[PDB]
C-alpha cells in the first residue's frame, strides 16, 4: 500500500528502472544530512547522539549543516512556540526535495506537558512529519532507532528519478506501525528486574 502526494494507491513498480530506483533510495537512506536546529532539550540529546560515546556518524548522519538548502532532514527537537512557529515554517519551506521530518519529544509530537497559551501543540499542526519519537527527552539511542526507521521508510519509497521523464509524484510507503509489529513480543514479557538492584 502506498500514498500519493503531488490518496491511497498500490505499488507502481519494468525491472531496470526499479533497480535504479533501489540504488537511488539506497544512496538516499545511507546519507541523511540533518539540519542544525537548536530549539530545546531534545536538541541537546540529539547532539549527545552525535558525539563519540554514541557515534551516529556510523550511519552517515554526522553532517549537521547550518543551512536549510544543504540539509535534507528536519528534526524538530523541542517545543513549537507561537513566536517560533513561523520560523520553523520558513525553515521547512527553505528546504529542498527530498525532505523528511522527525519530531523529537512530546513537545514536537503533541505539545507535551505544555498545554499553554504560548505553545503550539505539536509541529504536525502545520508541517508533515515522517517519524515521531516519544520521550521527554528521547534518549540518543531512541533517536538512532528513529533514524533506522526513517532509513527503512526511505528504502521503500519511490521518488521520481528525473524531472523530465517519469511520474512526478511522491510515493510514500504505508509501513506497518511499530506498536502492532512489536505487540507480539512486548506482551510476552513476564518478569523484569526488581528496582532495588542497580
Residues near ligand HQH (CB under 6 A): 47, 50, 62-64
110: left (phi over 0), alpha (psi -120 to 50) or beta: alpha
Site track 128-147 with ligand SF4 (rule: CB under 6 A), x = hit: --------xx----------
Q: Considering beta carbons, is residue 64 or 77 the nearer one to ligand SF4? A: 77
Residues 6+ apart with CB under 8 A from 21: 13, 158, 159, 161
Contact 74, 102 (CB under 8 A): yes
Grid coordinates representing 13 are 513498480
Residue 78's binding partner among ligand SF4, ligand HQH, another protein, none (Cβ under 5 to 8 angstroms by kind) is ligand SF4
54 or 159: CB nearest ligand SF4: 54
Q: Which window, 35-43, 61-69, 92-100, 183-191, contacts ligand SF4 (CB under 6 A)?
A: 35-43
CA distance 55 to 193: 29
Supply the minimum distance, in Å, between the C-beta of residue 182 and ligand SF4: 22
Residue 24 Cβ vs ligand HQH, minimum distance, rounded to whole Å: 18
From candidates 15, 53, 83, 185, binder to another protein by CB under 8 A: 53
What distances in angstroms separate CA 74 from CA 5, 65, 146, one per listed residue?
A: 19, 11, 13
The residue of the chain with the least Cβ separation from ligand HQH equals: 50
CB-side neighbour CA atoms (13 Å) of 127:
30
Select 34 or 137, whichever has its Cβ closest to ligand SF4: 137
Amino acid at each position: 500500500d502506498y500514498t500519493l502526494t503531488r490518496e491511497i494507491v498500490t505499488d507502481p513498480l519494468n525491472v531496470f528502472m526499479g533497480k535504479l530506483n533501489d540504488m537511488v533510495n539506497w544512496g538516499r537512506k545511507n546519507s541523511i544530512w540533518p539540519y542544525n536546529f537548536g530549539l530545546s532539550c531534545c536538541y541537546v540529546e540529539m547532539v549527545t547522539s552525535f558525539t563519540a560515546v554514541h557515534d551516529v556518524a556510523r550511519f552517515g548522519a554526522e553532517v549537521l549543516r547550518a543551512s536549510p538548502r544543504q540539509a535534507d532532514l528536519m528534526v524538530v527537537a523541542g517545543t513549537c512556540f507561537t513566536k517560533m512557529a513561523p520560523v520553523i515554517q520558513r525553515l521547512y519551506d527553505q528546504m529542498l526535495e527530498p525532505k523528511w521530518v522527525i519530531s523529537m519529544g512530546a513537545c514536537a509530537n503533541s505539545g507535551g506537558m505544555y498545554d499553554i497559551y504560548s505553545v503550539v501543540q505539536g509541529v504536525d499542526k502545520f508541517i508533515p512529519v515522517d517519524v515521531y519519537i516519544p520521550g521527554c527527552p528521547p534518549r540518543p539511542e531512541a533517536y538512532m532507532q528513529a533514524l533506522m526507521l526513517l532509513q527503512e521508510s526511505i528504502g521503500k519509497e519511490r521518488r521520481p528519478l528525473s524531472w523530465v521523464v517519469g511520474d512526478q509524484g511522491v510515493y510514500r510507503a504505508n509501513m506497518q506501525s511499530e506498536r502492532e509489529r512489536k505487540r507480539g513480543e512486548r506482551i510476552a514479557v513476564t518478569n523484569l528486574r526488581t528496582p532495588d538492584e542497580i
